[PDB]
């Protein structure tokens with residue numbers, strides 16, 4: 001239980017150069033029929049917090065803008081404690097996330113690369129979700145998910161995973177709510193023993209949240225106080 005801090009973005013004055021930004025709606029709405037067009041302009045730093053603002057704005061044929069940012073190509077880790085202190089909006093159509101993808105997405109694709117969603121929230125739910133996605137030993141898409149009640153997602157909460165060669169554990173405010181064994185690649189989990197990079201985004205619409213958007217919730221702000229990675 002002795003952790004050493006190996007990386008952080010505290011967003012004290014700006015966004016570090018460890019982050020790369022996506023642009024646009026991607027392929028079929030980032031694969032989930034999302035409605036937003038991602039931009040760099042939707043990411044700012046105010047008063048020591050990263051602010052991802054989703055807006056009702058027309059660009060590229062789309063009606064919403066937001067930010068999707070990642071450490072891919074800059075920083076990645078194999079095992080560790082990954083955490084962020086986040087305050088997010090709660091409205092119909094909202095889809096904020098703090099998550100990780102395997103560095104090998106560029107060669108094996110998704111979902112074989114593996115995905116660890118440290119925090120996902122949709123719509124106005126009074127809970128948050130922690131999930132892994134992968135391609136198992138039978139060549140089939142697999143997922144394993146858990147949730148925890150959070151009454152005020154609009155307040156800051158700490159979203160964390162502890163990940164080692166045996167397991168991934170999910171916590172909110174230090175409360176354990178989900179766990180997945182990756183020991184010996186059980187259930188075809190071999191790709192979780194590789195380097196993963198971090199992503200932050202707020203999507204608007206999509207298969208999971210649905211297409212009922214509260215247009216009176218714009219502009220909407222997702223606040224990240226910090227992102228920290230510790231390792232043994």
Ligand SMILES: [Ca+2]
Pocket residue numbers: 010011012048049224225226
């Ligand atoms: Ca900060």
